[PDB]
Write a protein that binds this ligand. Structure first.
Ligand SMILES: [Cu+2]
Ligand SMILES: [Cu+2]
Ligand SMILES: [Cu+2]
Ligand SMILES: [Cu+2]
Ligand SMILES: [O]
Ligand SMILES: [O]
Lengths: 534, 528
């Protein structure tokens, strides 16, 4: 009805400030200072809001206690992942934090970190999100956006017990290349050793910016034009805008099954999203190695405490913008549909049921997006946030990838004579894993002379969670199934290829769980299968 | 019939030229500490049997606060009639491992009540840093033990106060060894920085051990054990009327609520020594409520990992043998059926393989100890140590009842023969061992006031890791104290009080709540 508020690019707000129009950036900072200073029992404090995502958890004590053959994974946070509520839940999450910012500074808008604009590709994260200080009211302050100090502890307050979920009062959030897993003596010990290697704030920010550029590129970042390859996060965000329906656009579970039953490759918005979390939250895009431990256990790297890092919301505002662009480019600004009973539409899927959900329960456009409530006191659903302009009163200003162009079509195109086929990787066995991990796929072909060529087929980011489990035997058993284009390779070379996957993982984040990560990830033989041509 | 001797005796003999006894003892201890953790004669396995590493009952651990009950994941029996005979077997079984290394070797006893200990504390051979074996300097294996593997539940993502890393060294008063959470380790680091010198620490410990034995601050001349010290309590225990109440604190407590006078079970002074070596200052209630020196011996969790546990328990067995001799129970023991102390639910709760409500008797198996035939040992197998186990106790303190020992426990002419019962401390939460000290003040109409110390009670207990806020063990505290220190006409004027020394929840985040509860307690006082 009324003209939408305009969510704008954070980079654009910083440029306006750089040139003397400071009010916009100052309002945003002032709002963030205000929500960070509200008491933690207030539903609009940053601590409460960040706490909605993951920890502090609610538990299912009778489930935690089940034996190995009976137990099933569940999520003690409210956030929806690996399921069709991913986009809409996070839409409301961002909106709800924005309602909180507005309680400090009326009519302020939550901007977006435009992750795929020219600035980010060439320089990484805008410095307003990383810098130490800000000038507000002619006083220097700590930048509330670089990190957040916990006002109370994340703790289950169980007598005698400490675990890797737990984080003390005064804990400050960290990003790559630092670690902040501290709830057991060994985690804390490993964190202190790891962080001793990275003592200089300015160098740390350079490393982070450079990691973000490499992830976006899909290779080590070149000076000049940025040149995104077809494997990077840039390409993956472009791909997601072509996902053919909301179900497979929405989440990794739906997309995986779609990719096993349809020709070609769809990419859910959740995928490139996952990448940004891992880059910012402690995974080096890295390279060609057999395997690697990501010891930077940053808050953004797992779902447990990512919501306590302010950058979570700048990122997720960009993910919401991509969701809105997909709605516009595909005709879904006013309606969504979900394939009934498709993988991704069950509470049991992926992370498992959120508080108050039961195993087997169906997720649909009617499902409560807990804990978000309308003025009525009634639970928001997906049906309430399809159209951000008509139902929520805001829109997205201009930014990268608004428009389907020819330049973008071709970046996704199979070069002529290169393979149109896809690789399916299944090491369906084990999956007894602690924290997030990356799968990187390679093909090597040895010609007649004995000269080996390596083809990099791409990455897959599994954004997961830290786990505390009551039996030494069963953590949470999972199908490894991953698809990769073979478009990096000449079509006729596919039959001569020897495939491998490099896992990059947390390896427990500890020294008592790094002897079943060198020798149990190395005693896992993936199966590889190659489809028909298109 | 092999003889077990005073270790002070073996040490005198060493300093006078005769070294093979002490050298054989040390060699055997080096031997069993060097065996691998998976060998059931390794010291790690043997110390493991007592307490941690635990076997759990996960369905019980998940019970709600109204349904949960305490149980013990170690094999040791405590607060029940198998306390004396289970520990008898336990020491015997560690002697067998020592014999694995050095055939025919005998496990001595720390004679806690000899003249040396009253005046100088622990024999230095148990505290010395170093020892001469085969004209080489080795680390003294009796001083402490280094864990060859972690005490760990090996639960991914979890760490609790039960857990101690590989390379952990055992510690005594005045040091703390609770390290399984970041909080406990940090407090341990801060507490231990207050006690940085090993020589001073050894002095502090010897002085606390003397003060416990005496029952007041140690005097520099002759020892002068009061009626309230651990000396007196060991003496009182040799008069226990029957095995049932000799054997454990649950039986003796109900006996003392139901009969005139006071009995002392051998488990009681035994608890005293644990807390003395394991972190409690006898004088601690002049300073504060919290005993921060969380040493292995001070709780049942890891006490068995500290070598001195076996020298002490060798003396506890001695006292049980002596009680047997002096009361003619060398060959037969009796259990009052269904008396408190005869149930697996009593005190620490059931050991592995026992069920709530299950009876305990002389046929009950003393797990995990098994004969050459693979059959489980029972209390029937170990009543006469000479006849069935093949060893005796050499001479040492207290083995004869005498006029001097009778006049120590006896009420000064004109003093009260009555007794004080302290209760009204219903449903307290247990985290670690604690001590009660009772006092009386009397004020005349003219306004003069005298102060009386009535004595102490040591509750040897455990660390507890729970799955809910209010899911700790609950305990009714009941404690009985003699009134012998008071003149009889002051008793009706008296105002009684108790002081507690406790662990404060084990960690700083649990301390203020613990202190508030204890300070709030309004105990009831009852005079017989
Ligand atoms: Cu999320
Ligand atoms: Cu996210
Ligand atoms: Cu014991
Ligand atoms: Cu003991
Ligand atoms: O997320
Ligand atoms: O004990």
């Amino acid at each position: 009805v009324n003209a939408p508020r305009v969510r704008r690019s954070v980079r654009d707000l910083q440029k306006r400030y750089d040139n003397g129009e400071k009010k916009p950036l100052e309002d945003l900072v002032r709002a963030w200072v205000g929500i960070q200073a509200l008491p933690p029992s207030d539903p609009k404090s940053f601590f409460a809001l960040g706490g909605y995502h993951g920890e502090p958890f609610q538990y299912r004590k009778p489930v935690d206690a089940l034996p190995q053959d009976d137990i099933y994974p569940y999520w003690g946070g409210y956030c929806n992942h690996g399921n069709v509520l991913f986009p809409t839940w996070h839409r409301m999450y961002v909106y709800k934090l924005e309602e909180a910012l507005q309680s400090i500074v009326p009519g302020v808008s939550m901007p977006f970190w435009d992750e795929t604009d020219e600035y980010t590709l060439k320089h990484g994260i805008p410095s307003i999100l990383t810098q130490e200080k800000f000038e507000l009211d002619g006083k220097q302050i700590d930048n509330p956006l670089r990190s957040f100090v916990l006002p109370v502890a994340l703790s289950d307050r169980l007598p005698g017990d400490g675990n890797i979920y737990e984080k003390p009062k005064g804990y400050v959030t960290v990003r790559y290349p630092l670690s902040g897993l501290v709830g057991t003596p060994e985690a804390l010990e490993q964190t202190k050793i790891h962080n001793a290697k990275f003592p200089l704030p300015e160098k740390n920010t350079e490393l982070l910016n450079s990691n973000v550029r490499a992830w976006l590129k899909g290779d080590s970042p070149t000076p000049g034009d940025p040149d995104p390859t077809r494997n990077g996060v840039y390409a993956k965000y472009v791909r997601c805008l072509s996902a053919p329906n909301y179900t497979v656009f929405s989440n990794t579970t739906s997309a995986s099954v779609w990719n096993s039953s349809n020709p070609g490759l769809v990419t859910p918005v959740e995928s490139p999203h996952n990448d940004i979390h891992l880059a910012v939250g402690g995974f080096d895009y890295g390279g060609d190695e057999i395997g690697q431990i990501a010891g930077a256990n940053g808050d953004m790297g797992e779902n447990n405490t990512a919501g306590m890092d302010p950058i979570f919301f700048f990122h997720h505002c960009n993910v919401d913008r991509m969701f809105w662009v997909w709605q516009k480019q595909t005709g879904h600004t006013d309606r969504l549909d979900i394939i009934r009973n498709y993988p991704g539409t069950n509470a049991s899927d992926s992370q498992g049921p959120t508080p108050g959900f039961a195993p087997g329960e169906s997720l649909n456009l009617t499902t409560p997006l807990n804990p978000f409530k309308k003025a009525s006191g009634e639970a928001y659903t997906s049906e309430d946030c399809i159209n951000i302009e008509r139902q929520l009163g805001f829109t997205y200003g201009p930014g990268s990838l608004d428009d389907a162009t020819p330049e973008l079509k071709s970046l996704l195109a199979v070069p002529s004579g290169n393979s149109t086929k896809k690789l399916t990787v299944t090491g369906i066995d084990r999956a007894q894993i602690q924290g997030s991990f990356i799968m990187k796929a390679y093909a090597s072909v040895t010609d007649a002379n004995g000269k080996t060529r390596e083809y990099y087929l791409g990455h897959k980011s599994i954004l997961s969670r830290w786990n505390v489990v009551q039996c030494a035997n069963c953590l949470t058993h999972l199908d490894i199934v991953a698809h990769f284009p073979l478009s990096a390779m000449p079509a006729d070379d596919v039959p001569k290829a020897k495939f491998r996957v490099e896992f990059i993982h947390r390896g427990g984040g500890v020294p008592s769980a790094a002897k079943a990560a060198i020798d149990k990830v190395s005693a896992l033989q993936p199966k590889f299968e190659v489809s028909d041509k298109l």
